[PDB]
Structure 1
Amino acid sequence: SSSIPMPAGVNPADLAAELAAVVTESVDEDYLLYECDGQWVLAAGVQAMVELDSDELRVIRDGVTRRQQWSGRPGAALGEAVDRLLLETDQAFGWVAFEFGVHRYGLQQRLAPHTPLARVFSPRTRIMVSEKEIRLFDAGIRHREAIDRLLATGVREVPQSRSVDVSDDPSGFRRRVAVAVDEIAAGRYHKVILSRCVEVPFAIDFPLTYRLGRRHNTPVRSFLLQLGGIRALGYSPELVTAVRADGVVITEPLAGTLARDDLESNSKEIVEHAISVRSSLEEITDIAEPGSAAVIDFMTVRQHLGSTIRARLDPSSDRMAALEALFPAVTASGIPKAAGVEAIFRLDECPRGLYSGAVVMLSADGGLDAALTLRAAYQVGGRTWLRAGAGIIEESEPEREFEETCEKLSTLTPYLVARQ
């Protein structure tokens, strides 16, 4: 592993996104860029790919596709395949669909054939960009030369963004909210997050849009990818799960959005956060060593209220079982989870795919970092879209919930750089 000192006056997010744009374009390869605690890890090129679908698990390496049938928990099937990738490389990267978390609640039968659950790959090369340095892992002569070419040219200036209209309601979000409210009033469930897609009528430049949005967002994690026909970027507002090599499991649920003093005193925000903390604690307990489950920094301010649920991974459990136990996040699903998830199948455009799922980074040492996929842009086929939702409770009003989606979309809407 060779290192290059980081040039002065260069933001690591800008350089990592530029390396993903220029280097990957020149060699015409798939990639995933993941931002995790000041490190921007560019996973470049697909050495091997694990595709977990509702009805099949495939492992693709050098054009050879191996197909397997699988039963039981999807986390066990994904874990087994991902552990094999990690015998060859130090790290693996990918995304996990919202649909991966439905099996736990007895909803596997509702999934159509070929429904994607997860896409995890081992990269050919890794470029780690931080404020201090640029670290190269398994970088061939072509990659080294292309990186050197980038450092010499410097970073491109970000063009002005192109606006998008979010005022239409073609999916009938308002009507769908009204149905959810009626179901809550009838005591079917307490909460459900419903969403709407917003079509972007022009092609966007993903690395340039990523750079622009990143200068106006402070996320828990962020990502930029081009993998298997999918382009995506996002500013993850929540950590679903983080598993360390030592076995420490962390989950950080968030709630609500000087005074400041209002958020800490709001009864409606305190109850929802406490219910979620209790839910996360009950789930982490199923995979944790007895008595290791604890809430650190309960209901502390982070423009939002949040808590850190910590535990120690039981020897009879694993990282995927920890991910599966916490999936999907309460933030993007519902309370109770089982009824909330089922309501999403009926009242939301399904399959959700990447939206409200997770973007993951795994390590050979047993590490796992899973960021909740929200505040993300997607491009699949000739379709470019944004997706945002809102938590629906008994008191919820359809027109108010629609305005809330507009606010959540405003994290991306002013920062869309058109493809030139």
Structure 2
Amino acid sequence: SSSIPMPAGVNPADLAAELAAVVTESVDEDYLLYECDGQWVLAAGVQAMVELDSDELRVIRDGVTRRQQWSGRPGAALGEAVDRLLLETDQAFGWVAFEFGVHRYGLQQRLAPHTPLARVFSPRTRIMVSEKEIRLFDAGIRHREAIDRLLATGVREVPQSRSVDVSDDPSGFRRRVAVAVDEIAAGRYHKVILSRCVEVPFAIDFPLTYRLGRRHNTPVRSFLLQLGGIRALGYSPELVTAVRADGVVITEPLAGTRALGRGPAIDRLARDDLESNSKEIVEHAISVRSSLEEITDIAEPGSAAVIDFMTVRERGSVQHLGSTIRARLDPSSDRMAALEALFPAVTASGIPKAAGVEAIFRLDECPRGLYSGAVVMLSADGGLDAALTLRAAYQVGGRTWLRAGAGIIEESEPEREFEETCEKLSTLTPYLVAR
């Protein structure tokens, strides 16, 4: 229904990003493009926006802002508002900040007033691009004319990229890693993920950069957005949570990192090291055990299972150990409780997670916001899809930047941890298209 066959020789990622760039700009609207299992879903225009902050929940529709006090779990407040959105539209999209996950560990008093927790909106129109076709949902005459014009011209040539230097350490990442190593040696916690920002000294074209980077990456999900003054794109390496309409819940934790994309023989040596490395094996098994404990809080008794255990997952510039965990959502639970149970990811926080999150407040630049949070897609039939926001670029108020981190354990060395962030940054640094 309401479909256009995909033109031959055109790749869906390119056409969806082109539609996002040209159609939305012609009507000056916000958008969120989400890639999920072969479907590039362009959520165009804001019909209603849910803004969850640390001290308030706002629902903005047709110029009117409704403000709400909220108490208890952020997932319950977000869930109640998003369920209302989904009475009118089939899908809702947005982002969940890293800060959304601090409440379950009783650390919310450490958040400043007006700290963003989530931004979820119902789109006016949805354009779904796949290898087979383009499907239009609630597309008005103006948007249909804009799609027609784009299909008449085809996709733009991607210009040559512009390089960035990631070797500088202005935030003292090496020193912050050494502090964390000392705390771990003293028995404070077992692991913490610390990160560093890298400025991009020039403005980038987000849709063209998205296209270029997407051609050289194999993420589990990907996104491109322009929403409330934020531009962002990313090749999500990890699925935090997926809840299907039939009740099936999925989480796919990653652990350990070796370089990738350096040649067949060099990558094979790195793969063999990763697969048989004692430290990486231990961290991955401990992360799978944590995910299973968390999912049991929301699953039907005895339904949790590891359907793929400790296998190498290739993610462009890096490769990681990964496991796929499946469960059945208990009838007494719900998709927000499943997200709350699995958020923040171990890859975003540490072990024990409460101690890792507290250490991040002291040893990382906070609030993290989008970085190590999730980009989400929610559906009226109960669906939820939440991609871990790593391997991403951001643009807010004249500033463009990248952000990458590393899992610090007792045996970590600041130099190797800094090099690990460089390997992760290489998912984006060779593919930045200047504006």
Q: Mark yes or no: TM-score above 0.5.
A: yes
> C-alpha offsets along residues 94-132 of structure 1, whole Å, 9 cap, x if unaligned?
000000000000101000000000000000000000000
> Aligned partners of 1:402, 1:273: CA distance in 2, in Å?
21
Shift of 1:225: 0.1
Give the equivalent residue in structure 2 for 1:254: 254
The alignment yields a C-alpha RMSD, in angstroms, of 0.9
Shift of 1:300: 2.5
Shift of 1:404: 1.2
Shift of 1:261: 3.1
> C-alpha offsets along residues 337-364 of structure 1, whole Å, 9 cap, x if unaligned?
0000000000000000000000000000
Shift of 1:302: 2.9
For these two proteins, the number of residue pairs brought into alignment is 419
Q: 1:224 and 2:224 equivalent?
A: yes
> Aligned partners of 1:100, 1:26: CA distance in 2, in Å?
34
> C-alpha offsets along residues 58-111 of structure 1, whole Å, 9 cap, x if unaligned?
000011000000000000000000000000000000000000000000101000
Could you say what secondary structure the match of 1:124 adopts? strand
Could you say what secondary structure the match of 2:159 adopts? coil
310-319 vs 222-231, which deviates more? 310-319
> C-alpha offsets along residues 138-171 of structure 1, whole Å, 9 cap, x if unaligned?
0000000000000001100000111111121111
Could you say what secondary structure the match of 2:309 adopts? strand
Q: 1:147 and 2:163 equivalent?
A: no
> Aligned partners of 1:308, 1:401: CA distance in 2, in Å?
26
Shift of 1:407: 1.2
125-134 vs 283-292, which deviates more? 283-292
6-15 vs 289-298, which deviates more? 289-298
> Aligned partners of 1:368, 1:18: CA distance in 2, in Å?
26
Shift of 1:402: 1.1
> Aligned partners of 1:232, 1:331: CA distance in 2, in Å?
20
> Aligned partners of 1:302, 1:176: CA distance in 2, in Å?
28
> Aligned partners of 1:341, 1:405: CA distance in 2, in Å?
19
247-256 vs 222-231, which deviates more? 247-256
Could you say what secondary structure the match of 1:302 adopts? strand
Shift of 1:259: 6.3
> Aligned partners of 1:163, 1:273: CA distance in 2, in Å?
33
> Aligned partners of 1:346, 1:206: CA distance in 2, in Å?
32
> C-alpha offsets along residues 262-316 of structure 1, whole Å, 9 cap, x if unaligned?
3222111111010000000000000111111111122223333211111111111
Shift of 1:319: 0.3
> Aligned partners of 2:151, 2:384: CA distance in 1, in Å?
31
Which TM-score applies when normalising by structure 1? 0.98
> Aligned partners of 2:31, 2:424: CA distance in 1, in Å?
27
> Aligned partners of 2:416, 2:288: CA distance in 1, in Å?
26
Give the equivalent residue in structure 1 for 2:430: 414
> C-alpha offsets along residues 207-256 of structure 1, whole Å, 9 cap, x if unaligned?
00000000111100000000000000000000000000011111011123
396-405 vs 5-14, which deviates more? 396-405
Shift of 1:260: 3.0
> Aligned partners of 1:297, 1:309: CA distance in 2, in Å?
7
Could you say what secondary structure the match of 2:270 adopts? coil
Shift of 1:332: 1.7
Give the equivalent residue in structure 1 for 2:405: 389
Out of 323, 340, 344, the residue aligned to residue 339 of structure 2 is: 323
Could you say what secondary structure the match of 1:256 adopts? strand
> Aligned partners of 2:233, 2:53: CA distance in 1, in Å?
22
Q: Are residues 193 and 22 of structure 1, via their aligned partners in 2, closer, same or farther at CA, if it must alter by over 3 Å?
A: same
262-271 vs 245-254, which deviates more? 262-271
268-277 vs 299-308, which deviates more? 299-308
127-136 vs 391-400, which deviates more? 391-400
> Aligned partners of 2:432, 2:80: CA distance in 1, in Å?
38
Give the equivalent residue in structure 2 for 1:274: 285
Could you say what secondary structure the match of 1:309 adopts? strand
Which TM-score applies when normalising by structure 2? 0.95
Q: Are residues 165 and 301 of structure 1, via their aligned partners in 2, closer, same or farther at CA, if it must alter by over 3 Å?
A: closer
The percent of aligned pairs where both chains have the same amino acid is: 100
Give the equivalent residue in structure 2 for 1:183: 183
Shift of 1:136: 0.2
Shift of 1:389: 0.6
